[PDB]
Write a protein that binds this ligand. Structure first.
Ligand SMILES: C[S@@+](CC[C@H](N)C(=O)[O-])C[C@H]1O[C@@H](n2cnc3c(N)ncnc32)[C@H](O)[C@@H]1O
Lengths: 118, 202
């Protein structure tokens, strides 16, 4: 499970209703997988990231120096896009759990696959 | 540019189900169907490259493997069966495709976290009745909620009038883009399906 996937699975569309909450990640095994850098793709993902969920998951994975939000002119900032490419697409959770905030139940991640089935 | 025959030839090398589960309607999308469907999504509608794509009922991964090869930013496959996803994962590794993820879940029971989470949703859904509805119509409602821009799906041509009626009730745009056929596993002969593009009013 990549962190972009965690973000998709976790995030809510913010609107007039009350705040939704992400799945809390607790990882026990991670791997690094090189993904071909697609800067146009990373740039269009930036405004769609739910940052608070991304930072929480990145903290659990012991990632460091993580950007705390979009930088100025980030569409032209290759270093920012490269960093976010790595953090969103190249750090894969292989074993772990996702905690449901409404239930407290733990859903297992095994062989990189979250099992959300009850 | 990946030509149509090359795409299909690659998809012929996607391994299928070792032990298909009949009750889940497990069979791989036929390579001719998958290649024509994905080639059209990409070359006519530009709905794959640099996009984030969901494959509902991804199975052994034929449609997701092809989507990843056509330049998706990320293709995420969803399936209820852990055995199918194990095969999908092996296929992704053999093809050296790293722009893929997968999730085990019941597509009919996803939370509203999935709302408008993908650019494009693609699927070859099951057809069996569930709670007085065709399972493909339950998949379709879920797909439309997940997709920001377009849904591409295969539905029985004999059900076309119903799909058109639901699209009208949901105020969704619908276009039948091809009439296709493929054979089911011998244990099940021909099935006539429409390839349908669903999209949204602006
Ligand atoms: C016709 S197969 C799809 C073919 C797939 N594109 C492939 O190449 O393998 C239908 C898939 O739907 C899955 N499925 C059935 N019911 C489901 C459900 N409620 N939620 C998620 N997947 C389901 C099956 O496990 C199966 O893999």
């Amino acid at each position: 499970m990549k962190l972009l996937t965690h973000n998709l699975l976790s995030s809510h569309v913010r609107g007039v209703g009350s705040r939704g909450f992400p799945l809390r990640l607790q990882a026990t095994e991670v791997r690094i997988c090189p993904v071909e850098f697609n800067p146009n793709f990373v740039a269009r993902m930036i405004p769609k990231v739910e940052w608070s969920a991304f930072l929480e998951a990145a903290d659990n994975l012991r990632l460091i120096q993580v950007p705390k939000g979009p930088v100025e002119g980030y569409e032209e900032n290759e270093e920012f896009l490269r960093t976010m490419h790595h953090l969103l697409l190249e750090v894969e959770v292989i074993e772990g759990t996702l905690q449901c905030p409404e239930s407290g139940r733990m859903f297992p991640i095994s062989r990189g696959i979250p099992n959300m089935l009850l | 540019k990946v030509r149509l025959k090359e795409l299909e030839s690659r998809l012929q090398q996607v391994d299928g189900f070792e032990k298909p589960k009949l009750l889940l309607e497990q069979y791989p999308t036929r390579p001719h169907i998958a290649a024509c469907m994905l080639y059209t999504i990409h070359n006519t509608y530009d709905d794959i490259e640099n996009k984030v794509v969901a494959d509902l009922g991804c199975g052994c991964g034929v449609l997701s493997i092809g989507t990843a090869m056509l330049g998706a930013g990320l293709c995420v496959g969803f399936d209820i069966d852990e055995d199918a996803l194990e095969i999908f994962n092996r296929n992704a590794e053999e093809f050296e495709l790293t722009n893929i993820d997968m999730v085990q879940c019941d597509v009919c029971l996803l939370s509203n976290r999935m709302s408008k989470s993908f650019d494009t949703v693609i699927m070859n859904p099951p057809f069996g009745t569930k709670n007085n509805k065709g399972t493909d119509m339950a998949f379709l409602k879920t797909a439309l909620e997940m997709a920001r821009t377009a849904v591409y799906s295969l539905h029985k041509s004999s059900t076309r009038e119903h799909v058109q009626k639901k699209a009208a009730e949901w105020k969704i745009k619908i276009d039948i883009i091809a009439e296709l056929r493929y054979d089911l596993p011998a244990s099940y002969v021909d099935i006539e399906v429409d390839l349908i593009r669903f999209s949204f009013h602006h």
